[PDB]
Amino acid sequence: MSLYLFMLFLQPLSLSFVSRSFSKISSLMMSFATLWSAVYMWFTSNGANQTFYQVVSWGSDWSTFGVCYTSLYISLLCAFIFPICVILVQGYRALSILICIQTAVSLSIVSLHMLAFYALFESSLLLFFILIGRRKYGSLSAAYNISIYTFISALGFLISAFWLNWSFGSVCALLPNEEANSFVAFGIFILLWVKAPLVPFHLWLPEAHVYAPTAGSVLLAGVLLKISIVGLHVFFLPICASSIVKAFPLILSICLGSFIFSSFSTLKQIDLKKIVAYSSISHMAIVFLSSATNSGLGIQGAVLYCIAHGLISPGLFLLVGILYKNTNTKLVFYLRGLSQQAPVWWSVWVFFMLGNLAFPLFPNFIAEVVCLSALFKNHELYAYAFIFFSFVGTVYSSTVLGRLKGGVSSQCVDASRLDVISWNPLVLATVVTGIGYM
Template sequence: MWFLVTSCCGLGTALLTSFPIENLLRYILVLPLFGAFVLCAMPGNAVKLHRVWALAISLITLVLCTSLWASFVPCATEPFQQVIGFSAGWQGLVLVRLEFGIDSLSLWMILLTAALMPLAVLCSWTTQTSHSMSFMALLLLLESCLFGAFTALDLLSFYVLYECSLLPMFLLIGLGGSGPRKVRAAYLLVLYTLVGSLAMLPCMLLMWSQAGSTSFLLLVHENWEPARQLVLWWGLFLAFAVKVPMIPVHLWLPEAHVEASTAGSVLLAGVLLKLGTYGLLRFNLSLFDYANAYYGPLVMCLSLIGLIYASLTTLRQVDFKKLVAYSSVAHMSMVTLALFTMSDLGMIGATFLMLAHGIASPALFLCVGSLYDRSHTKALKYLGGAATAMPLFSIMLFVFSLCNMAMPLTPSFLAEFLCLCSIFAHNGAALFLALIAVVLAAAYSMWAYARVVHGMPKPYAFKALADLNRREFWCFVPLILMTIWLGIKPNAVLDSLSTSITFWHQASLATKETAPATWALALL
């Protein structure tokens, strides 16, 4: 394993010396897709070759993304850098130009995706043997689609890549899932997301008919009429609300997590849910300032309901994996609640919470996967006493349980503190309800940890009780390092995020106080 990591780092360094820095984004977008095509050409029974190739491609991609981050310099006047475009036409009648670029927001989403992909490959190292070629190729294809969605500067290309990310996830649940309802869970994921996206495409076409373009760089300067904003805003919001997910369109998420493999849950919680909040922050909050102020109280009400409801529902779960899934719904509700305070502080805190959740939640799903590989059950009543024979696992679960409940010196603490400060500046009653959810988060995190780690071990569940092996340990090490780094030195993220978010939301701040509020303001 160490030889493979060292070889990939050396190959990544060689690629960096031969490729110009300004073309890094192009190679990052294409490399996972190239790796997926090569995998499909390999023999179907070469299981070890499939795993090694997928891990090598994901590690090289991570090295390229790290180099892209090292060369990125935030600019207050020109947030997007390394903008690349691909043009295609047909007899002068149809002209399509796809634009991709990075700013601070998309850069951190790319880094999160690239960091989680090798972990998804490693945690599937011994479990995915019957469909290893298809499974690993789908992981790389999903990575390429996510890179494209996070960097797309054209609304139609974003829509296509946003929908394309569904197909690999659908097949990953179907191929890698272990539960009897995995096909139903995969169809729930696709149907919920497709129904929400049906409203997004007509709205994008309406924007194209008025502005003559679907380029985000042009649409952000378009003067939309207030009445038209109120219609267009709903089309985008419905699609992103399903992906977040917000109450009441959240029912697909616990089902998908329970039936998916560990790798599927890691990517679903770590990255795919962030597509919804990324879309809200990138498009809704940047394009429709009047509609944001008009519908903002309604979204905050829905977020508060989802925050309290998901926290209480998490407390009564008896399945460890479903407990972590419902906690994700609660944390993402906190993100949307802070986003629609429409303040710079709230948006920066919400984005940082997205990154913190993208570290803690995949780590907890890795813990669930490690337990399931040994005991073949996720029911909490059959788990217990892990500290007696699994001390290393117990330490990992303890650290990430603290991160999930937002203890100081973890990134979740600072992220939730920034979110709560923005909520307090907006509305005191909303802060009171959010604080109740914070207390509930501590309750269900410690309750689950105590049920799994303490007490008497259950010999009928743990027939071969063993601590983390070397491969599982190295899955946790990067997440531990990122947690410590972001918890102690959050300025590495916050400084760059503030530059991009402040640039894009000046207009929203200027019109927030003058736009009328909806009836939902009375509920706050």
């Protein structure tokens, strides 16, 4: 734990002292070293310690950091996917922004204090406002959308944290507190409602993904959407269970509506990144609802399905970024004959699209089975509703694949050696998790 935190603090530190020509190499080495430190944290985490594997405090309640089942999975996932982001991004400015964002996000996951969680997570507010609103390829509207949505939801969460700190005297997770108030429960809930894109607060995610860089999109999809489940398991369910059980019909209404309308909105997309971004929104609802059941199956299934999403959607975003570099287009209608023109890119694209459709040899299958089993434990109709409307995803995925597959094209647009190096780890991890090493 201490080694992981030290390395997380070391990565932004190194950029200040590097030569500004060695920045990429030093950043890549630092990212791999942080991954190794995360593996060490996993090694030193004994399953005998059932509640929390590790807890460290550095002199205050705010400096209390700890790893649990959800935290450990999410932290390993972010440390796994960061190096790919590092290689995809060029320039000292971009490297600095992405390193600071990753440091803040990775410190948020292991934090055990709601106020420190808020402080670390929202520190990356301007960095995305600048990142998504970059000079030539960015849009100011999307940056405004994401920044305002995050600010309002996080401020509601902050108000609830202040009320808890006033009443209980503490806001740390390790101190058992329960509240039945609905205002505080909604204050904590609204952040989850916005951060995990859930209709009708999902509008920020699409505009952000399309106008963010490929490394930015990879991080956003990979771990920033998963921060919702760390907040839910760590800071909402322990204290706000009475409210989630009181509002369960409403929770199901909103979750299933998000699933259905996000699936239907995906059908109206002509941009590849928008297609992947809307697939993410439909995928988040099952996670949110499975956790909300507050059962052993639901929590495990949600964290598993988060890992599956954080291995599948970064791959699709990376492949789309590679294709956009090769073609300078993201419109499906311009892109044809990709099967003949890019056999190696097409194979991986089809593999990852099959993963997104939750086919058996992929982690999404196991994760979906567990989540659907939890929903079936609550009620049969709950699982039946989700299982049927999964067919909408097949329609748009198949239409996109058919449009890209064949036609007449005069351009060889296939990936280079650097690109294949970029996705090889994701493919290997996807296979390893798919065979059951979840």
